[PDB]
Design a protein around this ligand. Structure first.
Ligand SMILES: CN(C)c1ccc(O)c2c1C[C@H]1C[C@H]3[C@H](N(C)C)C(O)=C(C(N)=O)C(=O)[C@@]3(O)C(O)=C1C2=O
Lengths: 156, 1043, 96, 144, 48
């Protein structure tokens, strides 16, 4: 990293929109990453800061940045139920089938926590329903392991 | 009583000497300490879970213990933190006055019932229960200047050779080692383990089996066979004692018959029990001891004894081993004793000077020089009687009692010299008459001064603990002063004073004294002339009195209040905080720069920097550190710019440029056992089951609102740490079962390699110590190392961790807080400039009331006490007023005349408020106690004026004005003598700079200001009080003389 | 049971001794560990110490080292007694 | 209170010198003291002197080769020769202990060691003489 | 012994001084107490 990179990261995590905008205006790197490879977009997707996500994307943030274990902001937003952020990310070109180092996709994550509406959005945008993580498991396998009957239906 | 001892001056001397004897004995035997117990008693439970994260610690240890912490007497609140180092501390704080030994025993008994519920690894570390509210007597550091020892070597030497001798020294009560005795460290290599189809499980099993101490019975053991001739012990396996013996533990015998020894899969070395803290003294590896005073011990005795014990070990130290003393409260305590004695010795000299200036003979001068030391010595015996100690507070109690003690001596002696001169009466008979005039009033004064000072002792909490010290000291000195004034000083007046010819006022003396006597006779005439004219139109001065009373109230309301002055204690701290996930090595560079700065740009002021990499006062962690700066003696640091406050601001400014970290310097509190005292201490509490993330959100909400009232609250901030990245690794149960890998082998391999594991004990040079297994560092650093660890399946195949695990980054807490058993987040803060912390606290609660449902709050620490002790000052002093009134009503046999004494109270207060306001000081406890001694003296002056006036009317028939004028003429000289001696005696305290000057300034300037206006104003005002009160409450003729 | 002196001392005596600090009014501590499998650790306190307090504080420190003792020693029961009082009487019992 | 006559001296190992060196130092001090009989008399140790003990070494390699576990070995030796508290039983209504120990005649002399067998993983009975050696040495019957 | 040998002379210095003081009050004299205190060896020699 470097100077204004670090202030943007903490700004995106804390949810300080005006300051994100100010640091943008001053030439801060939208794609500045910390030690684990999280960008401001990672941070804002994880903490659910929808407006910061938009502002970062409007300013050319890599929508498909991956951390050191291969996870993208879409993974985070889908895993922790941030539906509106999942739509914004997909609208801006987020790889709906991105896999982390474990073969895990946003659909696996959304399915594992039961976020039915996120699962439908991801499917609408072309999520491979038969995608398998490193253990051979699909979102369907996840659904029936969780006993989530509604999800199990939707995932054919 | 005075008549009895006038006729027996040797019996009087004998009582004085026995009093002095009892006091000197007390001084050789009383505990000495900087402060008495002031913090509420706290008990701390500490436990350790090696390799555990904060949430694991809290949910397997903290909550289990907390749920058993009920049914404990006098508990005020409980708080805990559980952190990423595997450590939990639960602090239970008890009401002031709780027996801390009982509180500890009850906590221990509740804890011991939850012990079987704790993980075995936590039980094996030892769960300690300690009294944690006492503070360090001294911190000993230990270095090796030869450069030949790591901190682990130094800690082992301290643990094995020094720690217990210290613990055994006279007056020591607790001892904390900076580090650990050696542990046997097995550093595993996962490549070599896999090569031989082995895991940490097999290593741990082989150590337990081959590092064992076996009970084997005896040859010829009982019950024996008939005819047995031999009895002998069977000795089987014994604990291993060396790295070599651990290395040849046999793990395995291969197929070809070759041997896999422990040293073929691990490095083996004596090392530390853990490695979270790097300790350095002036940049060299260090260990040390934190030493606490035993309850009721003499601190001066213990420090000397500790230093002697370490001197006697010094010849048997390994070459280079050096003891250092970065912290020791003993020197500061000695300065306090010396400054107080200095103040007493010179107050006696000043009384000599004033006594000679006015009474002009050396015989009269000897009597206060005798009586005052008798009362001070004797006061120690009364303190010994009540269990008190010689401390900063009791000693300043005695310098505050000088004015009252000196006054008793002057009042007795000056009155006999006046009776002799006005009446030509011989010594013995003038003392009998003079004592008859003052004796009843001296006893009423003793009651009245008890009602002034005793209610103080009933304040609650920490402040009451401080006041109680002043209250008991001053009352005991005062009572003893009255006894001595009824026994010894009359007998000394009757036998040492030489007669004065009637009407002789020394006006016919030559030289300076004759000038003085003619000037002071003139002045008394102007004074009584002035009072006469004032008495002609009393209404105008009743309006002036009201102006003074309103001005006092105005000044009082605007004087900022505070707790105890900050002191330059010769030591301060500098905090180091690095970003999330920052490593020990990165924190060490910042501490090195901090250490370099102090030993370079502050070389003249700094003696040492004791830097601790791995803990701070926000919490523990690789990204946190503290440097404790010990300064050269105050003597070698002359100047405002070389005091702690100035050094601290320069350092903080200099460290503003450090980019890797937040680095802040700051002074210690006056009472480090209590801390802060400035500001408030807020607890946000999860009272539904909202969970940590929701609690942080609520906390951030409250913090944002608070920053939007910067006119009310400033610097409101979390006390703890923010969430940090963590590595979340999921074990796939299905794949493990498919491969035939058991979950116990999986979790034990991961835990032992990456967190380390306490296996069992061994014997190192005769002493039992621990064995720990852990991966060598280079195979446990980054996520890619996870896959180099193999676990053996049931079918014997080696399976890499990558086959049955997945992982991801997430956020979680490095330090979880709980308050009274519920998840909590502590918020510090303070009232904005010129605002009351009591009102800042009201805003905090109003903001808090808007937070999401299920979030609640509570106040702790100094703020808890405030909310339970604000209603005290007016009611405790209503009580004091009423009892003073009642005592005065008995003394004068009147319901109205007490008002002419009680109205002098604002006269000293306005000068105290003026002196503190001008000097920019605060209404702190030293100011408050000075107020009561000033009020005490002023009331005593009025009581004797009014007593003389009333007696002149009652037993000599004089009318109101003649009696009032004559009383005021007689009382002028002793009032001025006491006030000149006391004001001078307190001047060194007002201008004091240096060691302890914060306290001395505080007692000095309110007292000096109060003394000035009390005397100047009372000698004109209490005649007005007496005349208007006598005129308003009356019936038949009293303006005119009668028979 | 069945332990030699060195085994007793190095698995029981030292473990307990290392936890015998932070006790009020302790003058000295002594112990012996012998071939019968027995250890006695005697802590002696200043004259005037409340012996009930001294016992309670010793017991509390001991009880923290208990999980470190071999299970066979825990199962025998580790007693903590005031040992400075003397025998009022000794009763013997025989069968004639 | 006891004695009251005389003195009560403690010699203390303050480096890690160990018991044998401490006995030597003690014997040194006792010899000197006996050479001032005008000053000190009857200065003597309060405790006991070192006595022969039977030191038995278990060979870890041979045990592993035979498939005999060390736990079965040490438990067989300890329970038979030292005895072992197993659990509790009820005797006429009152709870009391159960102890297992060898009958006296099989636990008296070194030759008895070899009459004790431990079962290997493969089910064979292995005599203690197969995986152990022993020697006489000196050690303390009472450590202070 | 090593913590209580300095006691007998100082504890009895104290006793001497207080006896003197008590005698001085009884007789209203600093000197007459000596004519009592000097009897102390007279009983001690017979005991010895
Ligand atoms: C604040 N404190 C007393 C210090 C200061 C400097 C230090 O260098 C250290 C400590 C704590 C001590 C506690 C000791 C403890 N014990 C007395 C051996 C201990 O069991 C632990 C533990 N939590 O496992 C340590 O951290 C510890 O080994 C340790 O490494 C310390 C340490 O390194």
């Amino acid at each position: 990293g470097s100077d204004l990179g670090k202030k943007l990261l903490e700004a995106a995590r804390a949810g300080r929109d005006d300051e994100v905008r100010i640091l943008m205006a001053n030439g801060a790197d939208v794609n500045a990453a910390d030690v684990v490879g999280w960008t401001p977009l990672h941070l804002a997707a994880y903490w659910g800061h929808l407006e910061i996500v938009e502002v970062l994307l409007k300013n050319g943030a890599d929508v498909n940045a991956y951390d050191t274990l291969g996870s993208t902001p879409l993974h985070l937003a889908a895993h922790f139920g941030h539906l509106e952020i999942v739509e914004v990310l997909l609208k801006n070109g987020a790889d709906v089938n991105a896999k982390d180092d474990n073969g895990i996709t946003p659909l696996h994550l959304a399915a594992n926590r039961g976020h039915l509406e996120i699962v439908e959005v991801l499917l609408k945008y072309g999520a491979d329903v038969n995608a398998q993580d490193k253990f051979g498991k699909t979102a369907f396998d996840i659904s029936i392991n969780n006993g989530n009957e509604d999800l199990a239906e939707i995932l054919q | 009583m005075p008549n009895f001892f006038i006729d027996r001056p040797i019996f009087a001397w004998v009582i004085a000497i026995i009093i002095m004897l009892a006091g000197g004995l007390a001084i050789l035997k009383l505990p000495v300490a900087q402060y008495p117990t002031i913090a509420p008693p706290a008990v701390t439970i500490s436990a350790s879970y090696p390799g555990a994260d904060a949430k694991t610690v809290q949910d397997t240890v903290t909550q289990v213990i907390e749920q058993n912490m009920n049914g404990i007497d006098n508990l005020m609140y409980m708080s805990s933190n559980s952190d990423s180092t595997g450590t939990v501390q639960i602090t239970l704080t008890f009401e002031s006055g709780t027996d801390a030994d009982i509180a500890q025993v009850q906590v221990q008994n509740k804890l011991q019932l939850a012990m079987p519920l704790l993980p075995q690894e936590v039980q094996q570390q030892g769960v300690s229960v300690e009294k944690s509210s006492s503070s360090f007597l001294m911190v000993v550091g230990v270095i090796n200047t030869d450069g030949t020892m790591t901190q682990e070597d130094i800690s082992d030497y301290v643990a094995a050779n020094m720690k217990d001798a210290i613990s055994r020294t006279s007056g020591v009560g607790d001892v904390q080692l900076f580090g650990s005795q050696y542990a046997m460290r097995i550093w595993m290599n996962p490549n070599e383990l896999n090569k031989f189809q082995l895991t940490p499980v097999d290593v741990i099993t082989a150590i337990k089996a081959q590092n064992a101490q076996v009970a084997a019975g005896q040859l010829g053991g009982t019950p024996p066979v008939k005819g047995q001739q031999l009895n002998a012990s069977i000795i089987a396996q014994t604990r291993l004692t060396s790295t070599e013996e651990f290395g040849k533990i046999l793990l395995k015998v291969n197929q070809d018959g070759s041997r896999v020894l422990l040293r073929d899969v691990a490095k083996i070395e004596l090392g530390g029990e853990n490695y979270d803290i790097i300790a350095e003294f002036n940049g060299q590896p260090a260990s040390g001891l934190g030493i606490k005073l035993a309850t009721g011990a003499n601190a001066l005795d213990t420090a000397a004894a500790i230093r002697a014990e370490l001197a006697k070990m010094e010849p048997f130290f390994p070459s280079g081993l050096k003891i250092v003393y970065p912290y020791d409260t003993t020197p500061f305590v000695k300065i306090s004793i010396h400054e107080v004695v200095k103040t007493l010795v010179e107050a006696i000299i000043l009384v000599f000077l004033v006594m000679y200036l006015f009474l002009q003979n050396f015989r009269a001068t000897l009597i206060p020089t005798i009586a005052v030391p008798v009362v001070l010595l004797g006061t120690f015996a009364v303190l010994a009687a009540f269990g008190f100690s010689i401390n900063t507070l009791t000693m300043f109690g005695m310098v505050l009692a000088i004015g009252l003690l000196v006054d008793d001596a002057i009042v007795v002696v000056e009155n006999v010299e006046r009776v002799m001169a006005e009446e030509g009466l011989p010594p013995k008979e003038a003392t009998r008459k003079s004592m008859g005039q003052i004796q009843g009033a001296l006893v009423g004064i003793a009651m009245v001064l008890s009602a002034v000072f005793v209610p103080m002792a009933f304040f609650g909490g920490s402040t009451g603990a401080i006041y109680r010290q002043f209250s008991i000291t001053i009352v005991s000195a005062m009572a003893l002063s009255v006894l001595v004034a009824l026994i010894l000083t009359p007998a000394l007046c009757a036998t040492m004073l030489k007669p004065i010819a009637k009407g002789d006022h020394g006006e016919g003396k030559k030289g300076f004294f004759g000038w003085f006597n003619r000037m002071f006779e003139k002045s008394t005439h102007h004074y009584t002339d002035s009072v006469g004219g004032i008495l002609r139109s009393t209404g105008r001065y009743l309006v002036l009195y009201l102006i003074i009373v309103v001005g006092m109230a105005y000044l009082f309301v605007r004087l900022p209040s505070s707790f105890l002055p900050d002191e330059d204690q010769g030591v301060f701290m500098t905090m180091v905080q690095l970003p999330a996930g920052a490593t020990q090595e990165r924190t060490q560079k910042v501490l090195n720069e901090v250490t370099h700065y102090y030993l370079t740009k502050e070389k003249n002021n700094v003696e040492s920097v004791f830097a601790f990499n791995g803990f701070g006062f926000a919490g523990r962690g690789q990204n946190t550190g503290i440097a404790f700066v010990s300064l050269k003696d105050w003597a070698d640091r002359p100047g405002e710019e070389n005091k702690v406050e100035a050094i601290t601001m320069r350092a903080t400014r200099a460290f503003s440029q450090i980019k890797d970290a937040m680095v802040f310097a700051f002074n210690l509190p006056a009472i480090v056992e209590l801390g802060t005292a400035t500001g408030f201490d807020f607890e946000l509490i999860d009272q539904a089951g909202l969970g940590h993330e929701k609690l942080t959100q609520a906390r951030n909400q409250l913090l944002a609102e608070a920053a939007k009232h910067p006119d009310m609250l400033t610097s409101v901030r979390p006390n703890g740490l923010e969430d940090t990245p963590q590595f979340k690794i999921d074990i796939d149960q299905e794949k493990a079962q498919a491969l035939g890998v058991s979950i116990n082998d999986i979790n034990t391999t991961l835990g032992a390699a990456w967190g380390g594991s306490y296996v069992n004990d061994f014997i190192d040079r005769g002493r039992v110590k621990k064995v720990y297994v852990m991966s060598e560092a280079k195979y446990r650093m980054l996520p890619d190392d996870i896959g180099d660890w193999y676990v053996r399946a049931a079918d014997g195949q080696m399976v890499p961790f990558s086959a049955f695990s997945s992982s991801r980054w997430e956020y979680g807490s490095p330090r979880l807080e709980r308050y009274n058993g519920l998840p909590s987040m502590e918020i510090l803060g303070q009232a904005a400039p010129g605002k009351s912390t009591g009102e800042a606290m009201e805003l905090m609660e109003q903001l808090a009331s808007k937070l999401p449902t299920g979030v609640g709050y509570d106040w702790t620490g100094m703020s808890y006490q405030e909310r339970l002790s604000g209603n005290q000052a007016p009611s405790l002093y209503a009580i004091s007023l009423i009892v003073v009134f009642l005592c005065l009503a008995a003394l004068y046999e009147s319901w109205s005349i007490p008002f002419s004494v009680m109205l002098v109270v604002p006269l000293g207060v306005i000068g105290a408020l003026l002196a503190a306001t001008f000097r920019g000081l605060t209404n702190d406890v030293y100011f408050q106690v000075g107020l009561l001694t000033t009020i005490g003296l002023s009331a005593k002056n009025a009581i004797l004026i009014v007593e003389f006036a009333k007696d002149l009317m009652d037993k000599e028939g004089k009318g109101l004005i003649e009696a009032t004028l004559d009383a005021v003429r007689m009382r002028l000289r002793p009032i001025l003598m006491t006030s000149l001696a006391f004001i001078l005696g307190v001047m060194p305290l007002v201008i004091s700079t240096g060691a302890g000057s914060g306290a001395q300034n505080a007692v000095g300037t309110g007292v000096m200001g109060g003394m000035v206006t009390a005397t100047v104003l009372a000698i004109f005002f209490v005649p007005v009080f007496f005349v208007v009160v006598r005129r308003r409450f009356s019936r038949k003729n009293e303006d005119i003389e009668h028979s």
